[PDB]
Design a protein around this ligand. Structure first.
Ligand code: MG
Ligand code: MG
Ligand code: MG
Ligand code: MG
Ligand code: MG
Ligand code: MG
Ligand code: MG
Ligand code: MG
Ligand code: MG
Ligand code: MG
Ligand code: MG
Ligand code: MG
Ligand code: MG
Ligand code: MG
Ligand code: MG
Ligand code: MG
Ligand code: MG
Length: 63
RNA sequence: UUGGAGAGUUUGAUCCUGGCUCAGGGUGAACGCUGGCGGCGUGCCUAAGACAUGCAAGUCGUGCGGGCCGCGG
């Protein structure tokens, strides 16, 4: 239910009463998009850098 | 004087500080896998929520008057 109320002349009011329909239909019609997710790139270098130094100095003791 | 053990864990390494973690005993327990026997214990820590049926409190004729029936005539 749409009401186009502001012009003196009706056929302008219809021009606007209509397009409030059509452009409203488009908004509720087209919805977001593809795609997700991205996956991690440098976990090969980065985290096996941290498993490098971790294993080495781990052969120590104590605390 | 019948009683007192610690380890792992920050650093390239070190010493200190300091948290985290584990091995110990315990239980009215539960859960998983398994399950032969006996004894002594022990078993609603939740909803002091709600409950079917039976049973948990009576007895005395040597306190008193009755009624129902068994017997003596
Ligand atoms: Mg996305
Ligand atoms: Mg280290
Ligand atoms: Mg310590
Ligand atoms: Mg430090
Ligand atoms: Mg001890
Ligand atoms: Mg224990
Ligand atoms: Mg069995
Ligand atoms: Mg079984
Ligand atoms: Mg028993
Ligand atoms: Mg109960
Ligand atoms: Mg109780
Ligand atoms: Mg209590
Ligand atoms: Mg109830
Ligand atoms: Mg309740
Ligand atoms: Mg009884
Ligand atoms: Mg009397
Ligand atoms: Mg009598």
């Amino acid at each position: 239910v749409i009401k186009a109320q502001e012009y003196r002349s009706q056929e302008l009011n219809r021009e606007a009463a209509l397009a409030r329909l059509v452009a409203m239909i488009k908004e509720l019609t087209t919805e977001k998009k593809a795609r997700r997710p991205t996956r991690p790139t440098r976990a090969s270098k980065e985290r096996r850098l941290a498993s490098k130094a971790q294993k080495s100095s781990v052969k120590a003791m104590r605390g």
